[PDB]
Amino acid sequence: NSNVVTMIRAGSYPKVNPTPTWVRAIPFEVSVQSGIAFKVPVGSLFSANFRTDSFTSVTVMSVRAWTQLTPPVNEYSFVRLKPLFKTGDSTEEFEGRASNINTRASVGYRIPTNLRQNTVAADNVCEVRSNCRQVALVISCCFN
Amino acid sequence: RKSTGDNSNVVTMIRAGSYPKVNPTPTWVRAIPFEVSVQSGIAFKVPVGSLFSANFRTDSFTSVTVMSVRAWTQLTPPVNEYSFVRLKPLFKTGDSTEEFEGRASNINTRASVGYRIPTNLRQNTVAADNVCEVRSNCRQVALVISCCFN
Amino acid sequence: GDNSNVVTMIRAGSYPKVNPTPTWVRAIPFEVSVQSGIAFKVPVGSLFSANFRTDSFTSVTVMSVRAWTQLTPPVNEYSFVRLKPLFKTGDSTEEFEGRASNINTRASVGYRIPTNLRQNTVAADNVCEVRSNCRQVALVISCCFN
Amino acid sequence: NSNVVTMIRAGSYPKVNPTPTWVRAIPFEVSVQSGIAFKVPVGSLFSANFRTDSFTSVTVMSVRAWTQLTPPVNEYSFVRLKPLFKTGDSTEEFEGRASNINTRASVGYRIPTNLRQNTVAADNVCEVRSNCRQVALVISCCFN
Amino acid sequence: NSNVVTMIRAGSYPKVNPTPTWVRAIPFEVSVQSGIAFKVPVGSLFSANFRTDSFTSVTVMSVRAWTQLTPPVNEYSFVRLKPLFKTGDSTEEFEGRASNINTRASVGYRIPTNLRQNTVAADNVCEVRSNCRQVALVISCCFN
Amino acid sequence: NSNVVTMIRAGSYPKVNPTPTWVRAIPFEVSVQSGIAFKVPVGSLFSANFRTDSFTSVTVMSVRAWTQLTPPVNEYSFVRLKPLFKTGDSTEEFEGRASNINTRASVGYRIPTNLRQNTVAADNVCEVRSNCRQVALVISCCFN
Amino acid sequence: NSNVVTMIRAGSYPKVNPTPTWVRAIPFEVSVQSGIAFKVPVGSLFSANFRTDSFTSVTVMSVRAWTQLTPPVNEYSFVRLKPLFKTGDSTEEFEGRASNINTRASVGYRIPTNLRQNTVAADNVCEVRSNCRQVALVISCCFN
RNA sequence: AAAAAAAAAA
RNA sequence: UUUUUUUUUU
RNA sequence: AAAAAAAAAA
RNA sequence: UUUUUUUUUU
RNA sequence: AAAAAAAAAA
RNA sequence: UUUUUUUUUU
RNA sequence: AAAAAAAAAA
RNA sequence: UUUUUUUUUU
RNA sequence: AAAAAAAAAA
RNA sequence: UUUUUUUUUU
RNA sequence: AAAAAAAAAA
RNA sequence: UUUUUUUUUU
RNA sequence: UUUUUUUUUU
RNA sequence: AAAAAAAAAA
Ligand SMILES: [Cl-]
Ligand SMILES: [Cl-]
Ligand SMILES: [Mg+2]
Ligand SMILES: [Mg+2]
Ligand SMILES: [Mg+2]
Ligand SMILES: [Mg+2]
Ligand SMILES: [Mg+2]
């Protein structure tokens, strides 16, 4: 391959876009109380910590969750996810459980194409329930 | 694919496994468009700092690997003249003396030119570094720089 | 293999992913009472009921609507039925219509909702507007409860 | 594909059923005591918690069981299942044991076609024995 | 081919629809001020000038823009489009520039299927910016 | 498929037309008297009820007709169509009859290409004859 | 194809015939009385209502008949056809009956080639019988 | 799809 | 032998 | 390259 | 059916 | 895609 | 004979 | 990848 | 017979 | 291995 | 249509 | 050249 | 599955 | 030689 | 997938 700078025969000025979209997998943690559902805010996805503070909307494609702290004594870890939608919240409770007390529980859900619209900071993605005090989420989304 | 394919109309369960490897602050390949002011008979040094800005969604980055530079005259040339733009590549390990140049063949049309950086000179640059020197008979140049933010 | 006559052991492994409250794709039949040449808005709430085993849902994604006249038409007339899709992001002005060709037979028509318009609806929402010369309309709605 | 609503050339009124059958995998837990067999009530399968409170009968196809809490000190988890049937109870004790003390024991059994009749709330599916105080069941069944 | 009227052996009364949908490419102009973004209202699409005043909703599919008047002295035309959505506005700025001062600048964006819902008069399609006092838009859409 | 907006690299301003043509199947009804031929006016085709009030001319391609009310006592329904043209009315009487007293009679005719010119509201498309007091018509035509 | 008038290189004067034959299906109705046969007169086929008043002879090929009014109370419609010939009348009574009281009864008969000679107005085609007060006939014939 | 009648073409 | 109109058979 | 209008040839 | 002229489409 | 000039390889 | 740099032709 | 239950299509 | 949802088997 | 987003090449 | 970056499915 | 909407035909 | 009208992609 | 039940090997 | 023990079939 070339070892030196070489000329580019550029033509006319192209179409440009200084603020393009970005497909991402955003990892973050939330605190969870015993017996209480936590509503995961969309605003958690906008932050300089993820290079995403210039975005104000996002299209979530899928949500995966893992317990992030150990479960109570004698128990195996569990985590549940209830998808929320601005046009109407769901009542599914997708749940994963651990089969070794020392291992994380995990589960996820995919959003169908027909339900992939934008959400903003004040929106909530889903409810989390767990017997562990923290849950780690990895959200696959399209910032725009 | 996607020929009548698509998927379901409802949320479905993912049988997730172990916690994956993750990175909250990944890299990003980009083409950044910005303009610079240039003066008659004077070479302007293009600062790398122009590439870090919220106007590009890149203010969380402190380094970038530049891969190629293209330039266009952004304002009209002087009376009776055709536009021209020249690019001289600059490197922290030793500046070049190439003067890549394009000129317009219609006075009403932009001049344009570019250069590609070879793999062996694709290291990082920071805000204090410069990308290239620009010369032109037009008072502004429009640059589109293809680069890897990291 | 098959044709075992007795219980047999399953070599179960790790606890699987589970969900006590899953989705359900359904064709729901219900009727609405209608007046003469008067549009009636069909409520989405008619889809949630113990009579359909769906009272545990609060949302549903409608995929298509079909409608039949349920009582006889006025004297000298053939039955007809009209459907005008309604949407929260913007109502339609289409009026899909069927008419009977025998005075003793039901009129029928339906419409399909495109993938890009298949979002959720709740009980307070309305599915469509119905218009008929008969006093009842029998609807069958294909939908995904979730 | 189409981006607008399209006509459906409906025909005669079809056959309908407002209350159809449902093939399900129902997850629920049962309490178990030391040295004592617990009879799992079929009524545990009818509940708004599973969207099944409008069913009063169910045809069980197979039963799988996992220990749901840690076992006593120095022991590995075990769980046994003895099928019950209204026409005659079995004496099999299908059993699984853990090989790591931190992991669940698991076993299941399949009901043959000739024994897949209906059960009601007052009936029992099986007996569960375990050294763990709780057992998690996932029962494959056809509600009707 | 036939030179006279011929008989049609009609059958039963078909399905009918007096107010059908309509896929269109609507052209209209908007005024733009220096350094100010103009919100393109969706209501502009329901006009007797387009045969569309019987519609109250539309599904937008793609937007294209051209500058419609000459740029300021010494400048080449430019135009920018920022898509707007009721579920969450975008921050993209798709931009084109003229490479000949005497020629229009042009650009567009396509709306993905998952974001192709309906819009009504009070909604806005996008934000337009340009150094020219007028921008010419052609909007591909489905009236319904 | 793509889940977010994408740039379109638009070119020169296209050829446009804000008021295009429209091929349509228009359903409407006319009253008919015993023993009297009813001239169907073309103006019936231009209406807000059809989204066609912006049109002043139309090219009719075919006409199909259905009896719309029940026939006289002891009679089977019939309907006849006589095509009319500005250059010369025809004398054909395309006719259909019901074979069940409770069923609609139907018939239609097709207009040859050499006779497919424009008609305006003052023109008449055909004469309708029937023993029922209303006839349902579906006219295939090209609005321009 | 050509859009202008074009020259025809005609030759010698051709054979001509200002009054040609015509193959036709003629539809008309006759009144029928209970228990009485009605002889269908051939003269009904020559009429300006059929464009055939310039003919005096016709070769009938086949006769189809349909009851034209409702039957008496409690009965299903029926119609019978007995062929009549100048060289010798037949004694066949071809018959159709309705299987639904609201539907027409129908039947026909074909005339063999060896019996396809001419008939004049004073001739009769066939006898019609029915429990309905009117019968609708469609006669396939060759006017000459 | 074939045939008969009128017409046109070859 | 193809097509157009009327008819018929399929 | 085909088609239409005029012409020429076959 | 080939060419020439006018037109049209590609 | 080939060729010529410098270089490198074979 | 292949590649890199400059050039040229296509 | 096949099957069973619900739906849709053919 | 294909797809979607639930289940199951592999 | 294919697809989606940004980029580059063709 | 290939490659690079992010993502996803396998 | 395929697809989507309206129409027509099969 | 072919064509016509609007649209889109190429 | 196929299948069902228990076992075993793979 | 084969084999061994019981059963059933051929
Ligand atoms: Cl749980
Ligand atoms: Cl803007
Ligand atoms: Mg844990
Ligand atoms: Mg230079
Ligand atoms: Mg009715
Ligand atoms: Mg345990
Ligand atoms: Mg310009």
Side-chain angles (χ1 to χ4, degrees):
Chain A
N1 198 206
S2 189
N3 280 329
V4 299
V5 295
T6 52
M7 194 149 58
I8 291 180
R9 277 142 185 84
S12 302
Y13 190 88
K15 321 298 183 184
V16 300
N17 185 7
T19 43
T21 59
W22 207 357
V23 182
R24 296 287 300 281
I26 298 299
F28 66 99
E29 290 70 54
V30 303
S31 304
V32 187
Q33 303 178 277
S34 182
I36 296 172
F38 178 71
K39 301 173 180 180
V40 179
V42 166
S44 298
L45 298 170
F46 307 118
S47 177
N49 302 333
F50 308 127
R51 311 190 193 275
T52 68
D53 49 315
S54 64
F55 295 98
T56 61
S57 308
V58 58
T59 300
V60 179
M61 298 180 297
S62 64
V63 177
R64 294 175 299 164
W66 291 262
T67 57
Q68 169 84 344
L69 296 166
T70 54
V73 62
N74 303 314
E75 299 185 19
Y76 296 86
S77 299
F78 83 77
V79 60
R80 313 187 187 120
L81 302 175
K82 178 202 290 187
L84 307 171
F85 298 105
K86 283 189 281 192
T87 55
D89 292 327
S90 97
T91 37
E92 283 71 54
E93 293 283 359
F94 310 107
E95 181 180 325
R97 306 184 190 176
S99 293
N100 179 316
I101 64 165
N102 293 320
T103 299
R104 302 179 184 252
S106 74
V107 81
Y109 70 88
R110 171 184 179 271
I111 299 180
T113 292
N114 44 299
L115 288 170
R116 289 189 187 182
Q117 293 79 56
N118 273 351
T119 51
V120 300
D123 297 330
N124 298 314
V125 189
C126 58
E127 289 188 353
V128 184
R129 289 178 175 276
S130 181
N131 60 343
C132 305
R133 283 337 127 118
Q134 287 194 27
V135 168
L137 304 167
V138 178
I139 299 193
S140 177
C141 49
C142 308
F143 291 94
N144 65 102
Chain B
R1 311 178 86 202
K2 277 145 40 189
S3 62
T4 58
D6 201 29
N7 317 85
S8 70
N9 292 127
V10 288
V11 292
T12 56
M13 174 143 56
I14 295 176
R15 291 174 165 73
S18 297
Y19 192 86
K21 313 299 186 192
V22 299
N23 180 13
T25 41
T27 62
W28 207 357
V29 181
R30 298 280 305 275
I32 304 297
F34 67 108
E35 294 64 56
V36 291
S37 301
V38 312
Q39 293 182 250
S40 172
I42 308 179
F44 180 69
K45 301 174 183 298
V46 174
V48 169
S50 305
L51 300 175
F52 308 115
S53 175
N55 297 334
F56 303 132
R57 313 197 188 271
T58 62
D59 48 303
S60 72
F61 293 99
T62 68
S63 300
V64 63
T65 303
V66 180
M67 299 186 295
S68 65
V69 184
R70 296 176 297 161
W72 290 259
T73 49
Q74 174 78 345
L75 293 171
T76 51
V79 65
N80 301 114
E81 303 185 28
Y82 299 83
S83 302
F84 75 83
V85 64
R86 315 192 184 119
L87 297 178
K88 183 173 88 175
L90 299 169
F91 299 110
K92 287 186 282 193
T93 60
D95 290 342
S96 299
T97 33
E98 277 80 54
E99 288 287 353
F100 302 106
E101 177 175 344
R103 308 179 186 182
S105 295
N106 183 301
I107 60 168
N108 294 320
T109 304
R110 303 180 185 250
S112 71
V113 71
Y115 69 91
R116 171 189 174 276
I117 302 174
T119 305
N120 50 296
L121 290 166
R122 292 190 180 185
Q123 290 78 57
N124 272 343
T125 47
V126 294
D129 300 333
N130 293 320
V131 177
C132 58
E133 280 188 359
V134 173
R135 293 185 177 267
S136 186
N137 57 352
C138 297
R139 291 178 179 182
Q140 288 184 351
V141 172
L143 299 90
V144 189
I145 299 183
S146 313
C147 53
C148 306
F149 288 98
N150 62 107
Chain C
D2 311 84
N3 291 131
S4 176
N5 292 292
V6 292
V7 296
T8 56
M9 185 141 54
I10 296 173
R11 291 172 164 69
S14 302
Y15 191 86
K17 309 303 182 186
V18 293
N19 180 4
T21 45
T23 60
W24 204 359
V25 180
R26 294 281 301 276
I28 299 287
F30 67 102
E31 295 68 56
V32 296
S33 296
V34 187
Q35 295 176 262
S36 44
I38 290 125
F40 176 87
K41 297 179 180 305
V42 180
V44 169
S46 294
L47 297 170
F48 308 104
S49 173
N51 295 326
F52 303 129
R53 309 192 194 272
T54 60
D55 51 312
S56 70
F57 291 101
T58 60
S59 304
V60 68
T61 297
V62 176
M63 294 184 287
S64 61
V65 180
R66 287 182 302 169
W68 292 261
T69 52
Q70 172 84 341
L71 294 177
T72 53
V75 64
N76 309 133
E77 303 181 31
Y78 296 85
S79 294
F80 74 83
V81 64
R82 314 188 179 121
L83 294 176
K84 176 173 79 176
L86 300 168
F87 297 105
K88 278 190 287 186
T89 60
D91 290 334
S92 300
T93 38
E94 279 79 53
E95 288 281 1
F96 302 109
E97 170 178 338
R99 315 186 183 171
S101 290
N102 181 309
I103 63 173
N104 294 320
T105 303
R106 310 176 175 256
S108 74
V109 73
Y111 69 83
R112 172 191 181 264
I113 301 181
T115 305
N116 49 288
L117 291 170
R118 286 182 190 187
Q119 292 80 52
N120 263 354
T121 38
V122 294
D125 303 335
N126 291 309
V127 180
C128 54
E129 274 200 5
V130 182
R131 290 181 174 267
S132 179
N133 54 352
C134 307
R135 304 213 70 185
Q136 291 187 13
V137 169
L139 295 138
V140 181
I141 300 186
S142 305
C143 51
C144 312
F145 290 94
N146 70 103
Chain D
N1 199 205
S2 180
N3 282 149
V4 288
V5 295
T6 57
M7 191 132 58
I8 294 179
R9 281 153 179 76
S12 293
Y13 186 89
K15 315 301 183 195
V16 298
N17 185 9
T19 48
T21 60
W22 208 354
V23 179
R24 299 289 307 271
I26 306 292
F28 68 104
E29 286 68 59
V30 297
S31 291
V32 188
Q33 301 178 294
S34 193
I36 301 177
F38 180 74
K39 295 174 180 180
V40 184
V42 170
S44 288
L45 297 169
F46 308 127
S47 169
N49 296 322
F50 310 123
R51 315 196 189 266
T52 59
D53 48 317
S54 65
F55 294 98
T56 60
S57 300
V58 54
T59 297
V60 174
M61 292 188 288
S62 62
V63 179
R64 292 177 298 164
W66 290 264
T67 52
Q68 169 85 346
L69 297 170
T70 55
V73 59
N74 306 326
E75 301 191 23
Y76 296 88
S77 297
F78 87 77
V79 62
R80 318 184 176 127
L81 296 170
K82 181 210 286 188
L84 310 175
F85 294 106
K86 279 184 284 188
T87 63
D89 290 333
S90 80
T91 44
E92 290 72 78
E93 291 282 0
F94 304 105
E95 178 176 331
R97 306 185 186 175
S99 303
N100 183 303
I101 58 159
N102 299 319
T103 308
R104 302 175 181 256
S106 71
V107 74
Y109 71 90
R110 175 188 177 269
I111 303 180
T113 305
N114 53 297
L115 288 173
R116 290 183 181 182
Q117 288 85 51
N118 274 337
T119 44
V120 293
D123 299 333
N124 295 315
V125 186
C126 59
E127 288 189 346
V128 174
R129 291 183 174 269
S130 184
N131 55 348
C132 304
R133 297 290 97 96
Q134 289 199 15
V135 170
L137 305 175
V138 182
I139 293 180
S140 183
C141 49
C142 309
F143 291 89
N144 60 108
Chain E
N1 204 14
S2 180
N3 281 152
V4 297
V5 294
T6 48
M7 189 140 64
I8 296 188
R9 282 150 178 78
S12 304
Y13 189 90
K15 311 304 188 197
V16 301
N17 177 20
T19 46
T21 59
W22 204 2
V23 184
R24 294 286 299 275
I26 301 308
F28 65 104
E29 287 75 49
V30 300
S31 301
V32 189
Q33 299 179 110
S34 177
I36 298 172
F38 176 74
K39 300 175 181 181
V40 182
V42 166
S44 304
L45 295 174
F46 313 115
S47 176
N49 300 343
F50 305 130
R51 318 194 185 269
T52 55
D53 50 304
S54 69
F55 293 103
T56 64
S57 302
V58 64
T59 297
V60 183
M61 298 189 294
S62 65
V63 181
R64 291 178 301 166
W66 293 264
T67 58
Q68 173 80 351
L69 295 172
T70 56
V73 63
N74 303 133
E75 302 184 26
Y76 297 85
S77 301
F78 81 83
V79 56
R80 314 187 183 121
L81 290 177
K82 177 208 289 188
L84 301 178
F85 298 103
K86 283 189 278 189
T87 55
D89 291 339
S90 78
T91 40
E92 285 72 65
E93 289 288 3
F94 305 110
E95 176 183 332
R97 306 179 190 182
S99 292
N100 178 309
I101 59 168
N102 298 320
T103 302
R104 300 178 189 251
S106 61
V107 77
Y109 67 92
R110 174 189 174 270
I111 300 182
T113 294
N114 43 289
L115 283 168
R116 286 189 186 186
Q117 290 80 55
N118 265 348
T119 48
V120 308
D123 299 333
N124 300 313
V125 188
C126 61
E127 284 189 354
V128 176
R129 291 177 180 273
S130 178
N131 57 344
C132 304
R133 299 292 95 89
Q134 286 193 27
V135 162
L137 304 167
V138 182
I139 299 183
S140 181
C141 47
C142 307
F143 291 92
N144 63 102
Chain F
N1 201 12
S2 177
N3 291 123
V4 306
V5 297
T6 55
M7 179 145 56
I8 295 168
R9 294 174 162 70
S12 303
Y13 193 86
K15 312 301 193 199
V16 304
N17 179 13
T19 46
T21 57
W22 208 357
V23 180
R24 294 285 301 280
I26 302 294
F28 67 101
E29 289 72 52
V30 306
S31 298
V32 182
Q33 289 192 350
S34 181
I36 291 169
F38 179 76
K39 303 184 183 292
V40 180
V42 165
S44 295
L45 296 175
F46 313 115
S47 167
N49 296 322
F50 303 134
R51 312 196 195 274
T52 67
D53 44 304
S54 59
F55 294 108
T56 65
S57 298
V58 65
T59 301
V60 175
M61 298 186 296
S62 68
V63 181
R64 295 178 295 164
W66 288 262
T67 53
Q68 173 79 343
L69 295 174
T70 58
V73 64
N74 297 325
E75 300 193 12
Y76 294 85
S77 304
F78 80 86
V79 65
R80 308 179 192 126
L81 300 179
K82 188 184 94 153
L84 305 164
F85 301 102
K86 278 184 290 191
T87 60
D89 291 341
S90 84
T91 39
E92 277 71 54
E93 293 288 356
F94 299 111
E95 170 173 343
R97 303 191 194 170
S99 294
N100 184 312
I101 55 170
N102 295 321
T103 300
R104 301 178 187 250
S106 61
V107 77
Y109 68 87
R110 171 182 171 280
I111 300 169
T113 297
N114 51 294
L115 289 174
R116 294 183 174 188
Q117 288 83 52
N118 269 345
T119 44
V120 298
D123 298 327
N124 295 317
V125 60
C126 65
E127 282 179 0
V128 175
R129 271 194 167 98
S130 181
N131 57 340
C132 310
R133 310 220 60 199
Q134 293 183 359
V135 169
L137 303 144
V138 179
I139 293 180
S140 303
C141 53
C142 314
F143 288 94
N144 66 95
Chain G
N1 204 18
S2 179
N3 288 150
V4 292
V5 294
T6 50
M7 188 137 67
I8 289 180
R9 286 157 177 73
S12 296
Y13 191 86
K15 312 302 187 190
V16 295
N17 181 8
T19 46
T21 57
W22 210 357
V23 178
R24 297 286 304 277
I26 307 296
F28 65 106
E29 288 70 59
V30 302
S31 302
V32 182
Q33 296 174 286
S34 185
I36 288 169
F38 179 75
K39 303 173 178 181
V40 183
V42 171
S44 298
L45 295 163
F46 310 119
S47 170
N49 303 332
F50 304 130
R51 311 203 200 267
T52 66
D53 52 313
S54 76
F55 296 99
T56 65
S57 297
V58 55
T59 301
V60 182
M61 289 185 291
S62 62
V63 182
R64 288 184 297 175
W66 293 261
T67 59
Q68 175 76 346
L69 294 169
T70 48
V73 66
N74 303 326
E75 299 181 15
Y76 297 82
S77 298
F78 79 92
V79 61
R80 309 185 188 124
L81 294 179
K82 179 202 282 189
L84 305 178
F85 295 110
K86 278 184 288 193
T87 58
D89 294 332
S90 79
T91 35
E92 283 75 55
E93 289 284 1
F94 305 111
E95 183 176 327
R97 311 187 186 168
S99 301
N100 182 302
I101 61 157
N102 297 307
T103 306
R104 302 176 184 256
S106 76
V107 70
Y109 70 89
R110 179 193 177 267
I111 300 182
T113 300
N114 50 289
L115 284 171
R116 289 181 184 186
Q117 288 84 57
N118 272 341
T119 46
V120 297
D123 294 327
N124 298 315
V125 184
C126 59
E127 288 184 6
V128 169
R129 294 182 175 264
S130 171
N131 59 346
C132 302
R133 297 293 103 90
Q134 286 190 20
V135 167
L137 301 175
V138 176
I139 297 183
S140 182
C141 50
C142 313
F143 284 93
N144 67 100

